[PDB]
Amino acid sequence: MATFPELLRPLKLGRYTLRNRIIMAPLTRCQATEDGHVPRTESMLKYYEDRASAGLIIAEATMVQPNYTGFLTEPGIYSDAQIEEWRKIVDAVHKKGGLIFLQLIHAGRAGIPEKILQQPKSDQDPLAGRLLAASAIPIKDHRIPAYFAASGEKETYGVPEELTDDEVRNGIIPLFVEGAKNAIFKAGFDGVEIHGANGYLLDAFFRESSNKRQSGPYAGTTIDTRCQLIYDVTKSVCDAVGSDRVGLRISPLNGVHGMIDSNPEALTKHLCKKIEPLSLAYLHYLRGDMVNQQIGDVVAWVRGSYSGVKISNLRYDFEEADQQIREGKVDAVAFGAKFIANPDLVERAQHDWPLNEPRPETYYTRTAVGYNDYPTYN
Numbered sequence: 123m124a125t126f127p128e129l130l131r132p133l134k135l136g137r138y139t140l141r142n143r144i145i146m147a148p149l150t151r152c153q154a155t156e157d158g159h160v161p162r163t164e165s166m167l168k169y170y171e172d173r174a175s176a177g178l179i180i181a182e183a184t185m186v187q188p189n190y191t192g193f194l195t196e197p198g199i200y201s202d203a204q205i206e207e208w209r210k211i212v213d214a215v216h217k218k219g220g221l222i223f224l225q226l227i228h229a230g231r232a233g234i235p236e237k238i239l240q241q242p243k244s245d246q247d248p249l250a251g252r253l254l255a256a257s258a259i260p261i262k263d264h265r266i267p268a269y270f271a272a273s274g275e276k277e278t279y280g281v282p283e284e285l286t287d288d289e290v291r292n293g294i295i296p297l298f299v300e301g302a303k304n305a306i307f308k309a310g311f312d313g314v315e316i317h318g319a320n321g322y323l324l325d326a327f328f329r330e331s332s333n334k335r336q337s338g339p340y341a342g343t344t345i346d347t348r349c350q351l352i353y354d355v356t357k358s359v360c361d362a363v364g365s366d367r368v369g370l371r372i373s374p375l376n377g378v379h380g381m382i383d384s385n386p387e388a389l390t391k392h393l394c395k396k397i398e399p400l401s402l403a404y405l406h407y408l409r410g411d412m413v414n415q416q417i418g419d420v421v422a423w424v425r426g427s428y429s430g431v432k433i434s435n436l437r438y439d440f441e442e443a444d445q446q447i448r449e450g451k452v453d454a455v456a457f458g459a460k461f462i463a464n465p466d467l468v469e470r471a472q473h474d475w476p477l478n479e480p481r482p483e484t485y486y487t488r489t490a491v492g493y494n495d496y497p498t499y500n
């Protein structure tokens with residue numbers, strides 16, 4: 123008898139059928155180039171192909187705005203050079219019979235000032251050379267880690283400029299659309315995930331602590347207007363590539379990057395109802411707080427307010443994932459740290475084999491160490 127039979131069941135998701143419900147969460151590993159944000163092809167190809175038994179891989183946060191870096195050496199999806207290398211990585215995943223979506227990010231107030239502010243403000247890009255956010259409120263009491271910093275030592279987050287409604291509508295949204303078209307039409311990704319989580323640009327409009335806008339369609343003053351940017355980006359991307367190739371990620375309780383909302387339950391339920399008519403491939407959420415402060419039954423909120431495919435994440439083991447699928451609470455579960463450490467995570471679930479332990483101190487080496495050196499089970 124199978125150990126985790128519900129977790130290992132196929133799942134209809136958008137226009138696809140996943141082989142199982144073990145999802146690889148998006149994981150920034152910094153294995154792209156600093157200058158051009160081009161994937162380090164063979165390194166990333168090995169890493170993703172080694173994990174391609176996953177029902178679905180969500181590839182790491184990938185830049186939609188030229189040079190708007192939050193992680194120093196993350197990949198982009200805005201240039202022809204990036205597209206060509208991604209195409210090869212995606213091909214390798216497909217050769218293993220896998221499926222892969224690309225997570226699309228704008229770092230917002232988590233942009234690296236020492237990189238972004240040294241870019242020339244000229245020509246065909248009015249958003250260039252500027253730190254940009256919902257409001258002019260910097261991330262406080264959290265330094266840029268040494269592994270994301272331009273200098274290789276801790277740096278300070280900057281005070282962002284408040285985006286005008288014009289810049290949001292005519293600058294930001296079209297970048298997400300173009301990025302999605304590039305990813306799917308040109309690189310061959312099966313879909314894209316909109317990054318509406320973890321304190322980055324879209325989440326910064328979504329939650330109270332970061333959106334203090336007093337007017338306009340993206341005002342911080344109501345739940346509906348705070349939901350509007352996530353809706354508008356997601357809708358525009360759906361119109362471009364098909365909603366059956368679009369997912370959305372949110373994190374209503376995650377306190378990273380000074381994120382907090384006074385009413386996450388009402389916020390979450392409203393967003394669920396607002397995005398229902400989009401017929402997304404899935405909604406992906408962090409069910410709690412990495413800081414262990416903010417509490418609430420996000421799984422229940424989403425299940426009661428959203429009729430589509432629900433992917434949950436954060437501190438799941440196989441047993442809990444299997445049980446929540448069994449109970450009809452979620453459709454699938456994404457795993458982060460366990461996929462870093464276990465290329466053959468799915469096979470380990472099939473056999474109930476023990477799991478490799480992650481080494482957090484080597485998450486961001488930019489070499490094979492702590493990246494391509496976790497073995498399969500003997």
Ligand SMILES: Cc1cc2nc3c(=O)[nH]c(=O)nc-3n(C[C@H](O)[C@H](O)[C@H](O)COP(=O)(O)O)c2cc1C
Binds near residue numbers: 182225320408438
């Ligand atoms: C090294 C590392 C990189 C990550 N990069 C991303 C990212 O690019 N996008 C994202 O939405 N979440 C990212 N996360 C959060 C994970 O997707 C996931 O939500 C988190 O690891 C919690 O799941 P777990 O308990 O299964 O590890 C990252 C987490 C880690 C540890």
